[PDB]
Design an enzyme around this catalytic site. Structure first.
Site, PDB file in Angstrom:
ATOM      1  N   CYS A  97      22.117  72.231  72.126  1.00 51.67           N
ATOM      2  CA  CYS A  97      22.393  72.950  70.889  1.00 51.67           C
ATOM      3  C   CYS A  97      22.638  71.985  69.753  1.00 51.67           C
ATOM      4  CB  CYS A  97      23.622  73.831  71.056  1.00 51.67           C
ATOM      5  SG  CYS A  97      25.155  72.890  70.882  1.00 51.67           S
ATOM      6  N   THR A  98      23.542  71.033  69.975  1.00 56.66           N
ATOM      7  CA  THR A  98      23.849  70.027  68.975  1.00 56.66           C
ATOM      8  C   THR A  98      22.578  69.500  68.341  1.00 56.66           C
ATOM      9  OG1 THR A  98      25.755  69.430  70.327  1.00 56.66           O
ATOM     10  CG2 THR A  98      25.099  67.915  68.581  1.00 56.66           C
ATOM     11  N   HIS A 112      31.810  67.716  68.735  1.00 52.23           N
ATOM     12  CA  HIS A 112      31.648  68.479  69.956  1.00 52.23           C
ATOM     13  C   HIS A 112      32.955  69.176  70.291  1.00 52.23           C
ATOM     14  CE1 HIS A 112      29.098  69.939  72.895  1.00 52.23           C
ATOM     15  NE2 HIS A 112      29.226  69.029  73.843  1.00 52.23           N
ATOM     16  N   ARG A 153      35.930  62.774  79.487  1.00 46.55           N
ATOM     17  CA  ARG A 153      36.271  64.170  79.712  1.00 46.55           C
ATOM     18  C   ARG A 153      37.368  64.331  80.745  1.00 46.55           C
ATOM     19  NH1 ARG A 153      30.431  66.992  80.334  1.00 46.55           N
ATOM     20  NH2 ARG A 153      29.956  67.407  78.125  1.00 46.55           N
ATOM     21  N   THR A 160      25.020  60.779  73.625  1.00 45.03           N
ATOM     22  CA  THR A 160      24.150  61.868  73.210  1.00 45.03           C
ATOM     23  C   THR A 160      22.702  61.475  73.440  1.00 45.03           C
ATOM     24  OG1 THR A 160      23.114  62.693  71.200  1.00 45.03           O
ATOM     25  CG2 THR A 160      24.789  60.989  70.972  1.00 45.03           C
TER      26      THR A 160
HETATM   27  N1  LIG Z   1      26.018  75.104  74.900  1.00 40.99           N
HETATM   28  C1  LIG Z   1      25.329  73.788  74.916  1.00 40.99           C
HETATM   29  O1  LIG Z   1      24.872  73.318  73.924  1.00 40.99           O
HETATM   30  C2  LIG Z   1      25.205  73.008  76.264  1.00 40.99           C
HETATM   31  C3  LIG Z   1      24.508  71.829  76.300  1.00 40.99           C
HETATM   32  C4  LIG Z   1      24.403  71.140  77.481  1.00 40.99           C
HETATM   33  C5  LIG Z   1      25.004  71.654  78.631  1.00 40.99           C
HETATM   34  N2  LIG Z   1      25.689  72.827  78.578  1.00 40.99           N
HETATM   35  C6  LIG Z   1      26.331  73.366  79.802  1.00 40.99           C
HETATM   36  O2  LIG Z   1      25.535  74.169  80.375  1.00 40.99           O
HETATM   37  C7  LIG Z   1      26.333  75.552  80.570  1.00 40.99           C
HETATM   38  C8  LIG Z   1      25.872  76.538  79.512  1.00 40.99           C
HETATM   39  O3  LIG Z   1      26.951  77.059  78.774  1.00 40.99           O
HETATM   40  P1  LIG Z   1      27.690  78.398  79.335  1.00 40.99           P
HETATM   41  O4  LIG Z   1      27.774  79.434  78.210  1.00 40.99           O
HETATM   42  O5  LIG Z   1      26.840  78.992  80.416  1.00 40.99           O
HETATM   43  O6  LIG Z   1      29.233  78.006  79.916  1.00 40.99           O
HETATM   44  P2  LIG Z   1      29.547  77.735  81.506  1.00 40.99           P
HETATM   45  O7  LIG Z   1      30.189  76.384  81.683  1.00 40.99           O
HETATM   46  O8  LIG Z   1      30.475  78.804  82.009  1.00 40.99           O
HETATM   47  O9  LIG Z   1      28.091  77.740  82.333  1.00 40.99           O
HETATM   48  C9  LIG Z   1      28.002  77.072  83.589  1.00 40.99           C
HETATM   49  C10 LIG Z   1      29.101  77.674  84.518  1.00 40.99           C
HETATM   50  O10 LIG Z   1      28.495  78.888  85.390  1.00 40.99           O
HETATM   51  C11 LIG Z   1      29.016  78.793  86.593  1.00 40.99           C
HETATM   52  N3  LIG Z   1      27.961  78.411  87.519  1.00 40.99           N
HETATM   53  C12 LIG Z   1      27.195  77.359  87.753  1.00 40.99           C
HETATM   54  N4  LIG Z   1      26.398  77.694  88.788  1.00 40.99           N
HETATM   55  C13 LIG Z   1      26.701  78.944  89.176  1.00 40.99           C
HETATM   56  C14 LIG Z   1      26.183  79.747  90.186  1.00 40.99           C
HETATM   57  N5  LIG Z   1      25.119  79.507  91.194  1.00 40.99           N
HETATM   58  N6  LIG Z   1      26.654  80.967  90.370  1.00 40.99           N
HETATM   59  C15 LIG Z   1      27.661  81.451  89.557  1.00 40.99           C
HETATM   60  N7  LIG Z   1      28.164  80.674  88.572  1.00 40.99           N
HETATM   61  C16 LIG Z   1      27.673  79.409  88.389  1.00 40.99           C
HETATM   62  C17 LIG Z   1      30.053  77.686  86.496  1.00 40.99           C
HETATM   63  O11 LIG Z   1      31.246  78.213  86.110  1.00 40.99           O
HETATM   64  C18 LIG Z   1      29.509  76.793  85.359  1.00 40.99           C
HETATM   65  O12 LIG Z   1      30.616  75.985  84.749  1.00 40.99           O
HETATM   66  C19 LIG Z   1      27.588  75.230  80.415  1.00 40.99           C
HETATM   67  O13 LIG Z   1      28.119  74.583  81.694  1.00 40.99           O
HETATM   68  C20 LIG Z   1      27.562  74.209  79.347  1.00 40.99           C
HETATM   69  O14 LIG Z   1      28.734  73.490  79.407  1.00 40.99           O
HETATM   70  C21 LIG Z   1      25.805  73.524  77.403  1.00 40.99           C
END
Ligand SMILES: NC(=O)c1ccc[n+]([C@@H]2O[C@H](COP(=O)([O-])OP(=O)(O)OC[C@H]3O[C@@H](n4cnc5c(N)ncnc54)[C@H](O)[C@@H]3O)[C@@H](O)[C@H]2O)c1
Ligand SMILES: NC(=O)c1ccc[n+]([C@@H]2O[C@H](COP(=O)([O-])OP(=O)(O)OC[C@H]3O[C@@H](n4cnc5c(N)ncnc54)[C@H](O)[C@@H]3O)[C@@H](O)[C@H]2O)c1
Ligand SMILES: NC(=O)c1ccc[n+]([C@@H]2O[C@H](COP(=O)([O-])OP(=O)(O)OC[C@H]3O[C@@H](n4cnc5c(N)ncnc54)[C@H](O)[C@@H]3O)[C@@H](O)[C@H]2O)c1
Ligand SMILES: NC(=O)c1ccc[n+]([C@@H]2O[C@H](COP(=O)([O-])OP(=O)(O)OC[C@H]3O[C@@H](n4cnc5c(N)ncnc54)[C@H](O)[C@@H]3O)[C@@H](O)[C@H]2O)c1
Lengths: 337, 368, 368, 337
Positions: free
Chosen positions: B155-156, B182, B200, B213
């Site tokens: 997204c960033t 962030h 982190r 990044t």
């Molecule tokens: N928003 C961004 O720009 C960005 C960029 C890079 C990475 N990410 C990461 O990728 C994910 C996307 O964001 P989000 O809104 O989904 O928050 P999020 O962190 O809740 O999404 C991933 C989460 O889903 C759950 N997960 C992973 N695998 C799973 C599975 N098989 N079954 C059930 N649950 C599972 C976990 O809780 C995991 O932390 C996040 O972990 C985010 O941190 C986001």
């Protein structure tokens, strides 16, 4: 129709402003308002809020003197003295003092002086005001109180149910506390404020305190005094807060017994006023929410059928305003003056 | 139309129905998601966000794994492995990577064969292979049904890029570097919790970590003509959800003021960069864009130049909301990108058609 | 040790067995081929190599289902459809993709659904989903749970990769491109026979084809450090099985003599590249490395330079034989990565692999 | 001197370690840890703390296999097996499993089952563990007791003086609550937490819940059950929490009388354990301080002389360790088992 200007265009100013837009049937012709702060700021401030978000209500105004928003063009000036704050230029109907700094009837008098007709104060006025609050002091309320007050959200919210509990079960003793948020009442930094605690920064520290709640309860509830006394806990949050009280109720009961009782009330009267449930909902779940507080059903424990913890996320700001709005329009009605 | 689902359940797994259900043009539809936490949660989860507010929707609890969305129902999976997930039975044309652990289309492929016609990559997958999919830039330039696991950069950058794109596009820029804000999240623990990374690890919402990044590289990944000219640091900062970078950039061009480029913004933002690029004028902050889907928020005023050419270029933005709108971006695109109709080959001439069936044709053993 | 199966014997897979038979401590073992060619034939076809001599080891041609070989009774299927063919009763952990036909990733599911747990994809990276993993190159990037469907990329690539790291790694390239001296094979029509390809359709044994091959791509696939950076077409030359690379590359380096580079190669050969990177010094030709298994084949001299940056890189190698003894190592890798074995070394420092399973650990969610 | 290992070793353990160092003459020679995290991390885990800042003690690791703190070599094993962790190469005396996941005696026994010999946990030992807390049960603890635990910080903190509470006046009823901080155990960001409350992100929302404080209350003191039972509130704070309890005491009194009745408590027993004052202090003014809390003698108001407020910023984190580190020393003391 109510040519009104409120003092202290705070969040609640915006709130009721938004409430003016929010609440329907607004005779509250609040075409002016006061806050000694910069008005175009206040405009943008009105325009842009944090919690309920920016008031997307686009406003077009020509000249510093005249401001128009959502058709309802609304004046506003910035000044300290209510006499230096002309109200007769509009023959002001109602004022509420969000500043808090005018915590006595004289300012309202001074507001009545410059041409106001009615006054109420969201804040508990220091001394010379018998406050009016829905659920508690809106029944015997008279529109013929050109100057009145509300109490802090705390009382403004904690009132009815336990009174109705006092109505339906009574309370030997009540120990009320809140998760009272932070505000201008406390210093962002550890700035010099009368209350050392309110003086402190406390970005993550609470303030052990006591708002007028355990005091205004006297007025709003001629019964529940002393026995039914707790304190306030002014927390390092900006937002919707939670009630935290344990009562020693009079009549023997248990948790659910009050709940449906607390339910039915909102099912008829605390409708809009208050609420109750047990679905776990956190602050965010209460943005711009009007039913002042849903009471938890589970953790509202009951010991010896008197010792009864009570808990409810409450809107210290908007629902407060809601409640503030509630009788506000009511006094607009029965418009004796 | 297109059969959709979500790998796992995330805050982005929480992100899109807010959009999607709130959407009005979404051809496709999710029908299932792997909430391994129960609808009751998932609903309470999805019905109630932490930032954008409670879902303004009657997303209701029909059966514990098949709930409602204001009447529309959706199934639920509960698992952490592609292979059991019957995207085939689910027929899912498009699934959204919600483990993150799939930094690899391969693992996403573990759903492709499982009946994922296409796989919505969401994050910067360490698997470079997938063409770097970014709106305003390469979104169309993506190839449909070609390696149907579809990338989605950070997204960033993903928000920065179209902006970052337009700048050199408006200017031509020697190179660039920056630092976003962030927002605090889970990945950095609220606690100083044991972490594969020192950064982190720490207690999140107090300390403020600058970090790595590849999103900076991802610019080149989406702006190959701009390769190498990119840099910056991932400043993990304590906010709920908004990031914003100012981009240091030695603009290859003359070094005229930015407002011009911002006029070009005012041109190009209002141009194709609507939806993403906003240049508001009132200098405003995080709240002023919450629930607002303009996936980039530049401040012309705040943005400045140094030597007229070294432009100090800022833009507010959320980190998932706008990102959640990137979901719809290819979604409706890949939807219409989906063939639907048939092909016009010649299984004699293009006997590969006949070979698509007759794959055991010596007439067909190409490169193999 | 691990039960293995063939869906029709891979021309390479055939020797690969004898190779595997030439292998001793093989954690794997074939049990069946999908012989749609008759056992004794397949047997002969197996027992008899057409290039490096018949097997110098007994083959007992027992009944149409199961001949044996030096006491290795291996079963026989005959079908293009896997599912029915039960590698599960055959307990075949990983099945040789004995077709190529299932060049599609999802092809192998039927074979997982035929009794495979992982998949020996014999196919070069026709699809995109699965990455092959390469000894000396990208083998170790594999952990278990990583793509049970696992490609066998082109020997061309597969011999391209090993040395091709040194350049970008030991000395640094800008970019470049290559071309095999692809030996003649069957997948080009002996005569001018009806075949969807332009050229291979033409008469084979006599000519050479400048030929499409994304090996360079497939390298950039497993070498994202070279993603979208290299090039090269093939040259199906008339030999049974051997090839040398064309390879020219604008090296980033100053332009030191190759010798050192080749020493560095030989150093790197002495490094992770035993059996992988031969940099010999005898000027020798096709025969002179037949049935030699050292994956690379360079008379260090031969690969040379024009003006330093541009590097005339060339090296003989096998296309099937060595190629095979590349498959095992990786085929072994899975067994080397096979569950049941004790695999705990250090999490008190390197818990990276530990929480590689779960990123929501104490703190493991790198890249959010 | 007592060879000790720490499973699930964490902040409070790190705290305990910063305690351990601050515990000059720490009779626990804690030469072992279990922590699946990285060493330099584990160093920084102790080395670099948020709340008490970095450990004011330099950490050196030789090179990665072992880390030495304050001139003493230390180890940190990492294996999710509750036994494989080699507590036997030293034949560990005391183990502290931070993970708390073995609320059954087993995992702790499983820790003992390869060399370890004694146990205490941050998790309240459910059942098959002595309800052992300083101030209340560390004494009746005979050192033959090997696998014990500590209940909630709250439980841990309230324990001594709340025992003294019913001492000086007797308590009709008691319903306690905490201003419990936020941690990662509750979802710091929205994730799959059983408690829907503890499931959101809620960096600024509270969590209605309960605690062993509501439960071990009986286990630490028999009559103290049900009528003497409250709930928990995980609040948006990182630090020293406060007790939200009003005790319905038996003997009629006024506030300071009980605080007078609790001056002595600090003056005799709470010394080191707890404290009390009325100068307004906030959690930071309780940071790294071992007296588990100071009671708001002032705002611990009396109401009806039976239902009496109790309020005290309590060290949910450091004293919690400290108290356990105290309890550790207690078990470092009287060493037989
Ligand atoms: N928003 C961004 O720009 C960005 C960029 C890079 C990475 N990410 C990461 O990728 C994910 C996307 O964001 P989000 O809104 O989904 O928050 P999020 O962190 O809740 O999404 C991933 C989460 O889903 C759950 N997960 C992973 N695998 C799973 C599975 N098989 N079954 C059930 N649950 C599972 C976990 O809780 C995991 O932390 C996040 O972990 C985010 O941190 C986001
Ligand atoms: N529940 C309670 O405890 C309670 C009740 C009533 C009022 N208040 C206080 O009043 C405010 C209520 O909430 P809010 O959203 O309106 O926040 P707020 O602080 O913004 O409201 C007060 C406004 O009055 C203005 N002010 C100060 N002195 C003034 C003066 N002489 N003349 C005109 N304006 C003046 C301030 O600038 C401010 O805009 C809060 O500041 C709060 O502290 C609190
Ligand atoms: N030998 C190699 O190194 C290699 C590797 C990959 C591809 N190729 C090319 O592609 C083909 C595969 O070569 P190979 O090495 O695997 O030897 P191969 O050609 O013998 O492999 C295919 C064999 O399995 C059977 N077969 C073909 N399609 C099948 C299907 N759908 N299901 C079951 N059995 C099937 C046939 O008996 C065939 O002999 C060849 O035509 C070759 O030209 C060669
Ligand atoms: N501080 C308090 O007031 C309090 C009260 C009750 C419970 N707790 C629990 O104790 C923890 C806080 O104590 P802390 O500051 O010492 O940090 P900490 O969080 O690191 O201690 C316990 C942690 O061990 C982790 N764990 C699980 N398996 C592990 C393993 N093999 N190796 C290492 N760790 C493993 C768990 O995630 C658990 O959170 C929190 O997890 C909290 O939930 C704390």
């Amino acid at each position: 129709k109510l040519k009104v200007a409120i003092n202290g265009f705070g969040r609640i100013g915006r709130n009721f402003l938004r409430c003016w837009h929010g609440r329907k049937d607004s005779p509250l012709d609040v075409v002016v308002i006061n806050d000694t702060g910069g008005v175009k700021q206040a405009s943008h401030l009105l325009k842009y809020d944090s919690i309920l978000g920016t008031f997307d209500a686009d406003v077009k105004t020509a000249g510093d003197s005249a401001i128009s928003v959502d058709g309802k063009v609304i004046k506003v000036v910035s000044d300290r003295n209510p006499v230096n704050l002309p109200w007769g230029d509009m023959g002001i109907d109602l004022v509420i003092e969000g500043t808090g700094v005018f915590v006595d009837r004289d300012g309202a008098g001074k507001h009545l002086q410059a041409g106001a007709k009615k006054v109420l104060i969201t804040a508990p006025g220091k001394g010379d005001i018998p406050t009016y609050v829905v659920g508690v002091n809106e029944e015997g309320y008279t529109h013929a109180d050109t100057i009145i007050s509300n109490a802090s959200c705390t009382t403004n919210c904690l009132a009815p149910f336990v009174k109705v509990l006092d109505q339906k079960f009574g309370i030997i003793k009540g120990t009320m506390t809140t998760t009272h948020s932070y505000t201008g009442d406390q210093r962002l930094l550890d700035a010099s404020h009368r209350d050392l605690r309110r003086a402190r920064a406390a970005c993550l520290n609470i303030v052990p305190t006591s708002t007028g709640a355990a005091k205004a309860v006297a007025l709003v509830l001629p019964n529940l005094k002393g026995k039914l006394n707790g304190i306030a806990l002014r927390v390092p949050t900006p937002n919707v807060s939670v009630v935290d009280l344990v009562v020693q109720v009079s009549k023997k009961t248990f948790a659910e017994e009050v709940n449906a009782a607390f339910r039915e009330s909102a099912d008829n009267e605390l409708k809009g006023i208050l609420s109750v449930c047990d679905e776990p909902l956190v602050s965010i779940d209460f943005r711009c929410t009007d039913v002042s507080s849903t009471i938890d059903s589970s953790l509202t424990m009951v010991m010896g059928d008197d010792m009864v913890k009570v808990i409810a996320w409450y809107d210290n700001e908007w629902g407060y305003s809601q409640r503030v709005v509630d009788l506000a329009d009511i006094v607009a009605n029965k418009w004796q003056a | 139309k297109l059969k959709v689902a979500i790998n796992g359940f995330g805050r982005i797994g929480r992100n899109f129905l807010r959009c999607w259900h709130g959407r009005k043009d979404s051809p496709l539809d999710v029908v299932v998601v792997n909430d391994s936490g129960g609808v009751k949660s998932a609903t309470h989860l999805l019905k109630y966000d932490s930032i954008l507010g409670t879902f303004k929707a009657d997303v209701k609890i029909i059966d514990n794994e098949t709930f409602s969305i204001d009447g529309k129902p959706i199934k639920v999976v509960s698992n952490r492995d592609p292979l059991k997930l019957p995207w085939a039975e689910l027929g899912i044309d498009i699934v959204i990577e919600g483990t993150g652990v799939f930094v690899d289309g391969p693992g996403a492929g573990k759903h492709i064969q499982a009946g994922a016609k296409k796989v919505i990559i969401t994050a910067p997958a360490k698997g470079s292979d997938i063409p770097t999919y970014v709106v305003g830039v390469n979104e169309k330039d993506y190839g449909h049904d070609v390696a149907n696991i579809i990338s989605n950069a950070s997204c960033t950058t993903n928000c920065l890029a179209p902006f970052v794109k337009v700048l050199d596009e408006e200017l031509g820029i020697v190179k660039g570097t920056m630092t976003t804000t962030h927002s605090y999240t889970g990945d950095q623990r609220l606690l100083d919790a044991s972490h594969r990374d020192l950064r982190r690890a720490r207690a999140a919402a107090l300390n403020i970590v600058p970090t790595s990044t590849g999103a900076a590289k991802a610019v080149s990944l989406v702006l190959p003509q701009l390769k190498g000219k990119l840099n910056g640091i991932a400043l993990r900062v304590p906010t709920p959800n908004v990031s914003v970078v100012d981009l240091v950039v030695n603009i290859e061009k003359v070094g005229v003021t930015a407002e011009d480029v911002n006029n070009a913004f005012r041109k190009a933002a209002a141009g194709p960069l609507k939806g993403v690029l906003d240049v508001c004028d009132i200098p405003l902050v995080s709240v002023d864009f919450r629930c607002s889907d303009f996936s980039s928020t530049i401040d012309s005023s705040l943005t400045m130049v140094m030597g007229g050419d070294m432009v100090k270029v800022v833009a507010w933005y959320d980190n998932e909301w706008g990102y959640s709108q990137r979901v719809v971006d290819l979604a409706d695109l890949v939807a219409n990108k989906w063939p639907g109709l048939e092909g016009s080959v010649a299984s004699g001439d293009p006997l590969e058609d006949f070979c698509k069936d007759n794959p055991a044709d010596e007439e067909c053993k190409l490169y193999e």
